[model samples]
Target chain A: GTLQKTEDVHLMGFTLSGQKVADSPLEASKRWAFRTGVPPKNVEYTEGEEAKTCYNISVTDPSGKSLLLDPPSNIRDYPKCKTVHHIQGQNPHAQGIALHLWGAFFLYDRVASTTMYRGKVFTEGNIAAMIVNKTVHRMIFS
Target chain B: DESPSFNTSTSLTFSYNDCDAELRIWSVQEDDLAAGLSWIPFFGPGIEGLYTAGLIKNQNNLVCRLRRLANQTAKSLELLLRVTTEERTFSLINRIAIDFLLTRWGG
Candidate 1:
C-alpha cells in the first residue's frame, strides 16, 4: 500500500521595503533562508511589468518541495504601487503578513492552480512611510 | 556562376595538420503522425567526453557513430554515440524526477 509522504517547511520575514519593494521580497527570502538554515539548490528571478506587477518569493526544501508566498486575492485585486512600500489600512493585516511572510515559504493559490513565481507587490507611502514602511511593517505587525 | 567581378562562394580551407569538426542540426514536421527530427553525431563526444542537446515540438531522436579523420601526415581516433528520441515533449521537459537515478550526463 502507498502512504502519503508529508513534511513541514517554515519561512519568516521580519521586515519589508516599499520604495525598494522590487528588492524587498528577494531580501526577505535571502534573510529567511539564512535564518532558517536552508540552502536552495538554485535561485531565480522574475520581473513584472506595469499592468500586472508582482514578485514571487519561493523556497525549495531538501525534499524538493517548492512553496510560493502570496496574498489571498493578489491575483484578482492587484496591490497599488505606493511611493513608499506601506501596507494599506483597509488591507487585512493578517492577509498582508500572510502574503509577504508565508509567501517567503511557498506561494499557494488553490483557485488559480497556477503557482505564481518571482511576482511583484506594489504600494505607496509618505515621508514616514519612506523610512519605516518595510521595517516597521514586519516588526510591529508580524 | 561566374561574372566579370569573378565571384564564387569562397570555399574554406584547412591545414594539413588541423582536422575540422562538423556540426549540423535537422528538423522534420508532419500533421499525420507527429513532428520530429534526428541528428547523428559523426564524431563521438568531441574533446570533452560529454555531448548534450535538446528536442522541441513533439519528439526527436539522436544517433551517434564512430567517425575518423584522415590526413597525409597521420590519422585521428574513432568515436561511438547513441540517441533515443523521447516520445513526449513533457517527458523531455519534466526530468525523470528520481534523484538517485538521475545523473549529470542525463540531465
Candidate 2:
C-alpha cells in the first residue's frame, strides 16, 4: 500500500502510575502483538530475585516484522541483555511496518543511556509478511 | 568625526551527530551577486565538517545591511532539514563538528 508513517501510530509503554490492573500483562502483550505484527504465544512473566517482573515474550514474523534486535550475540560490548518491547499504535503500516524497542532496564553500563534514550526506528520487510507468518503460509497475505 | 553608523553580527548554533559527521559543504550560492556560487574546498589537513566563523563586526554606515548565519546545521543527525536561515541564498561560512556520543547523553 503506502509507506507507514511512524508519526501516525500512537505508541505508549510504562507501568500504571498509581493503580494496578489485573490483566495489565495480557493487555500489554496483545497490544504489543498488534503493533509489531507478532502474535504472542507461550509467554511467561517471572519475578526476578528482586521481585521484578521479567516478561519473556516471543512471536515469529517471517517478513522480519520482529522487533528491532540489539545486534546479534557476536557483537560484544554492545547493549547487553538486549530486549524489545512493542509500543501501541507505533510503527503503523502493513508493508514495511515500523517496529521499535527500548534498551532493557537494569542496565548499568554507559551504552545504556545512548541506546535507550536515542529514538531509533526499524522496519520489517513487508506488511503482508508481518501480518501473516510468511514462513508458515508460504503465500502473500496482509 | 563619526557618522550615525551601526554594527551588526550574525550567528547560528546547532547540534550534530555521528551520522552527519561525513557531510561537507557541496556548494554555496549568492543569486543576487552575479558571481553565482563558489565551492569551499575540503582539501589539505582539515578537521572534518566542523567549521565556525569568527564574529564579524559590521561598523560601516550602509543603506542595505546584509548578514549571514555564522553557525548553521551542516549534518543530518535527526534526519530531515533541521536548519533555519533568514536569507534566500548564503554561504556556509563555517563547517560544523558535533559529537553525537557526547550529546547523546542528555544533561
Give me the candidate number with maximum TM-score.
2
lDDT of 2 by residue, A78-142 (tens): 12222344443223243321222221121111111111111232111101112223343355324
Q: What is the lDDT of residue B77 in candidate 2?
A: 28
In candidate 2, position A117 carries an lDDT of 15
Docking verdict class for candidate 1: incorrect
C-alpha DockQ of every model? 0.01, 0.01
**How many angstroms is residue B75 displaced in model 1 relative to the true structure, after the best TM-score fit?**
79
Would you estimate the TM-scores of all the predictions? 0.17, 0.22
Model 1 spans with C-alpha error above 4 angstroms: A1-54, A69-77, A80-142, B1-107
lDDT of 2 by residue, B1-107 (tens): 00122333532222211122222233322332343221211111123323433333323412112212212322332232346544355343222213333445668
| Residue A97, model 1: Cα distance from true site in angstroms | 11
